[PDB]
Amino acid sequence: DEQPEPRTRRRAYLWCKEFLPGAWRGLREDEFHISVIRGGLSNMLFQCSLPDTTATLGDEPRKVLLRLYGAEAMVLESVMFAILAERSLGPKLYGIFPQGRLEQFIPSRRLDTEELSLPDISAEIAEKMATFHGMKMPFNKEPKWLFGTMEKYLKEVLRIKFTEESRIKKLHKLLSYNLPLELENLRSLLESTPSPVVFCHNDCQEGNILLLEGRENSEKQKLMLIDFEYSSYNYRGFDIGNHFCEWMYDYSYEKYPFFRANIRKYPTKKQQLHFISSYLPAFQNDFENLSTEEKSIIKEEMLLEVNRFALASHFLWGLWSIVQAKISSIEFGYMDYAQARFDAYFHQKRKLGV
Amino acid sequence: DEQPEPRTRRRAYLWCKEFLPGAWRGLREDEFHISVIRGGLSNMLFQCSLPDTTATLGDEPRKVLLRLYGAEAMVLESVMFAILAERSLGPKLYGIFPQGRLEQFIPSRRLDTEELSLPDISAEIAEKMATFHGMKMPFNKEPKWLFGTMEKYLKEVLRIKFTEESRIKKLHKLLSYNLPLELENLRSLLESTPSPVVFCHNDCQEGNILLLEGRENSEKQKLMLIDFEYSSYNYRGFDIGNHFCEWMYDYSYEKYPFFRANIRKYPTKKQQLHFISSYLPAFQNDFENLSTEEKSIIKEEMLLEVNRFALASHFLWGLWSIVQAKISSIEFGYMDYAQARFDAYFHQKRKLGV
Ligand SMILES: c1ccc(-c2ccc(C[n+]3ccc(N4CCCC4)cc3)cc2)cc1
Ligand SMILES: c1ccc(-c2ccc(C[n+]3ccc(N4CCCC4)cc3)cc2)cc1
Numbered sequence: 272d273e274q275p276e277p278r279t280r281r282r283a284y285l286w287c288k289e290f291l292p293g294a295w296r297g298l299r300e301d302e303f304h305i306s307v308i309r310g311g312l313s314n315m316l317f318q319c320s321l322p323d324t325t326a327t328l329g330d331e332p333r334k335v336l337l338r339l340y341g342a343e344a345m346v347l348e349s350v351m352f353a354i355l356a357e358r359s360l361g362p363k364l365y366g367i368f369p370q371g372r373l374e375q376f377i378p379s380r381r382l383d384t385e386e387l388s389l390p391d392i393s394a395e396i397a398e399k400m401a402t403f404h405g406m407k408m409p410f411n412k413e414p415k416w417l418f419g420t421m422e423k424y425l426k427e428v429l430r431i432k433f434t435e436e437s438r439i440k441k442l443h444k445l446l447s448y449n450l451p452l453e454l455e456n457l458r459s460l461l462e463s464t465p466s467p468v469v470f471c472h473n474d475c476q477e478g479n480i481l482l483l484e485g486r487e488n489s490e491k492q493k494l495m496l497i498d499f500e501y502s503s504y505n506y507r508g509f510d511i512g513n514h515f516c517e518w519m520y521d522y523s524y525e526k527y528p529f530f531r532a533n534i535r536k537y538p539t540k541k542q543q544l545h546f547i548s549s550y551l552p553a554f555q556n557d558f559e560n561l562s563t564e565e566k567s568i569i570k571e572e573m574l575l576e577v578n579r580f581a582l583a584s585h586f587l588w589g590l591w592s593i594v595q596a597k598i599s600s601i602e603f604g605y606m607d608y609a610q611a612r613f614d615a616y617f618h619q620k621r622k623l624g625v
Numbered sequence: 626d627e628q629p630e631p632r633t634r635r636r637a638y639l640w641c642k643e644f645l646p647g648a649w650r651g652l653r654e655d656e657f658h659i660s661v662i663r664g665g666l667s668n669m670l671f672q673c674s675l676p677d678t679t680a681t682l683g684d685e686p687r688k689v690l691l692r693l694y695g696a697e698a699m700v701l702e703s704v705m706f707a708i709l710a711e712r713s714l715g716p717k718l719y720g721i722f723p724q725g726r727l728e729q730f731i732p733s734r735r736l737d738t739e740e741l742s743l744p745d746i747s748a749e750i751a752e753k754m755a756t757f758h759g760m761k762m763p764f765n766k767e768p769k770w771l772f773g774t775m776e777k778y779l780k781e782v783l784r785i786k787f788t789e790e791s792r793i794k795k796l797h798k799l800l801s802y803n804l805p806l807e808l809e810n811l812r813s814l815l816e817s818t819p820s821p822v823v824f825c826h827n828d829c830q831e832g833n834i835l836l837l838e839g840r841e842n843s844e845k846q847k848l849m850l851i852d853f854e855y856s857s858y859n860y861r862g863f864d865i866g867n868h869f870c871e872w873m874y875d876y877s878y879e880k881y882p883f884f885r886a887n888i889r890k891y892p893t894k895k896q897q898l899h900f901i902s903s904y905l906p907a908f909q910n911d912f913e914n915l916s917t918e919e920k921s922i923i924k925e926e927m928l929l930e931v932n933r934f935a936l937a938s939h940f941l942w943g944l945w946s947i948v949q950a951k952i953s954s955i956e957f958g959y960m961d962y963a964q965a966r967f968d969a970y971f972h973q974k975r976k977l978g979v
């Protein structure tokens with residue numbers, strides 16, 4: 272039960288005391304409870320709570336999550352979080368201030384990578400993603416994020432000056448593919464691949480999926496999608512394909528490079544069909560009433576869409592990871608991860624015949 | 626039908642094209658319609674619309690309001706607006722970006738000052754305010770805004786160096802009252818005056834109240850409260866008292882000083898009772914089920930609360946207006962308005978025996 276720095280205890284006390292109603296408003300500092308959930312220099316997380324000896328007066332929460340930003344994107348993330356809260360699709364928003372926010376505390380654990388392929392879990396992930404994809408949001412609907420971001424990252428990658436010989440070497444190999452050519456060939460392929468533009472999560476991986484406490488044996492509604500920091504209007508195919516890619520990566524590996532990759536854990540076509548069979552009726556209400564025939568066509572075309580867009584997930588994250596090898600302060604094998612993503616890019620390309 | 630500057634037409638076109646769905650996404654610039662609703666250097670307003678010859682594809686609006694900011698408060702105002710939109714208490718939010726936002730266009734006119742005293746109108750204002758006062762919001766609940774703001778303004782007022790002799794003269798008269806003494810005597814009075822802390826509009830005047838098109842002959846639900854720029858947790862008494870004060874001021878007067886003030890248009894006790902008789906059942910659901918006796922006590926105590934807090938409305942706006950005489954760029958008799966507010970402050974004080 273890790274205690275925060277005294278400075279952070281006092282600030283957390285004041286934010287809770289001033290932003291939360293009822294018993295919080297009169298709470299003594301010496302009866303304030305706080306423990307560190309995630310440390311670091313940015314995006315730090317703390318649990319704050321009333322003493323067990325203090326009764327609630329109304330509907331105020333007894334326990335909350337404090338998120339600290341630490342080390343216009345802020346306007347947009349805050350507005351998004353507030354709207355998702357109002358719509359019961361994310362944790363409630365209790366307080367917002369320059370340094371962070373107070374959010375609803377949701378008893379839960381994160382999923383592990385192996386759990387993504389469980390048929391019931393996968394079905395519910397698909398339903399939750401489809402629900403998210405139906406959200407009308409006050410943000411730019413031109414789907415510029417995907418290629419805008421890859422172009423931005425590639426610009427950065429070509430200008431990196433590594434000093435470490437192992438990274439110099441790995442970078443030269445990755446750039447030997449002619450990444451500008453490959454990106455513009457990918458742009459050509461996806462231009463010819465229909466995919467509706469919807470509000471996408473953009474990071475649907477096990478670490479962003481809560482298994483809700485007390486719901487673990489429930490048939491449905493045991494999950495919640497969280498961490499919408501990178502959510503935007505984007506091609507639907509990307510959100511689904513990106514999720515499929517995440518079946519292959521275990522970030523809990525406790526030896527350098529601090530991930531495991533397995534190409535054979537990508538969902539099989541059978542598994543992919545199971546996922547999209549749950550997605551579609553959740554996204555298009557009367558989908559079930561279509562003939563078995565029309566449903567089959569729509570499913571086949573979606574399989575093609577999502578597996579092509581999976582290529583963009585590899586390329587995007589490969590580029591992202593090279594930049595992180597230059598700019599990150601976390602211990603992680605970023606260059607080896609980049610190579611894993613580009614390996615999967617070319618393996619997938621070959622399987623698609625593209 | 627005033628057209629905007631070409632620069633603004635092009636930016637408005639792009640914001641509408643990129644943030645609004647359906648027919649907007651493919652709209653040609655030469656079929657984009659825009660007209661200026663309010664000009665100026667800040668908070669400019671434009672109406673944007675589809676051509677009549679373009680059909681809607683889905684549920685997209687045919688007409689919207691563009692608000693431009695022009696010349697962390699922004700995070701908070703945006704989050705507030707988004708939440709009020711979600712809760713159906715304000716116009717929908719269609720787009721948010723650094724320079725402004727796209728809002729729902731609400732066919733309507735503003736009320737005139739004379740209309741505030743109409744019994745049906747006043748009853749509905751009271752119901753809408755009570756509804757607003759029930760809103761739980763993610764903002765600081767310590768009621769520091771009222772006196773914090775008056776102290777801030779008074780600091781500014783004491784440091785103003787006017788160059789215009791008529792303003793030098795008017796300022797000397799207003800400061801001759803010993804405003805620090807008077808403010809701290811007001812703080813003492815209000816400290817002893819119970820008033821619940823609720824989410825307040827803080828500017829409930831006729832210019833911020835829409836009379837909804839086609840609802841003018843409807844028994845109820847003909848109004849909408851707008852312009853929450855200054856909304857905050859605050860003493861309930863202030864929101865109601867401030868509204869009552871606004872019965873006395875007509876800002877449509879077309880000769881200098883560009884307002885009329887009439888002390889005799891403050892609501893009579895009968896009118897005040899009519900207002901609070903609508904407020905209470907809208908704020909406290911089972912209020913009607915109380916005995917005539919308990920209801921009468923609660924009403925009497927509220928009359929006292931609100932008329933004491935009305936003094937703060939005078940003092941706050943008096944101070945505010947002196948600062949505006951120094952810093953504003955609008956033609957308005959700010960010093961004469963300040964004197965009108967302090968005149969009403971002392972007149973009200975004398976009637977209260979305080
Ligand atoms: C070891 C431990 C944690 C991390 C890590 C920490 C935080 C994040 C946050 N993040 C999530 C999604 C991101 N995206 C980049 C564009 C697509 C989505 C970028 C960054 C990603 C990875 C990396 C290595
Ligand atoms: C590429 C490389 C690594 C990862 C990744 C690695 C680890 C994790 C789990 N995780 C561990 C630590 C995290 N943080 C530590 C402090 C900042 C946030 C956030 C997330 C999630 C994602 C994602 C993409």
Ligand SMILES: c1ccc(-c2ccc(C[n+]3ccc(N4CCCC4)cc3)cc2)cc1
Nearest residue numbers: 774827828854855876883941945955956957
């Ligand atoms: C002539 C025409 C318009 C105006 C005017 C224009 C905009 C506003 C906006 N405003 C609304 C409320 C304000 N408050 C100050 C603290 C209480 C609420 C301050 C400013 C107020 C007055 C003043 C003179």
Ligand SMILES: c1ccc(-c2ccc(C[n+]3ccc(N4CCCC4)cc3)cc2)cc1
Nearest residue numbers: 663664665666667668832876942946957962
């Ligand atoms: C003290 C003094 C004047 C007023 C007041 C005066 C006029 C109005 C009506 N009004 C007229 C013009 C307004 N604007 C013009 C460009 C910026 C906003 C806004 C509001 C509303 C309030 C309010 C308080």
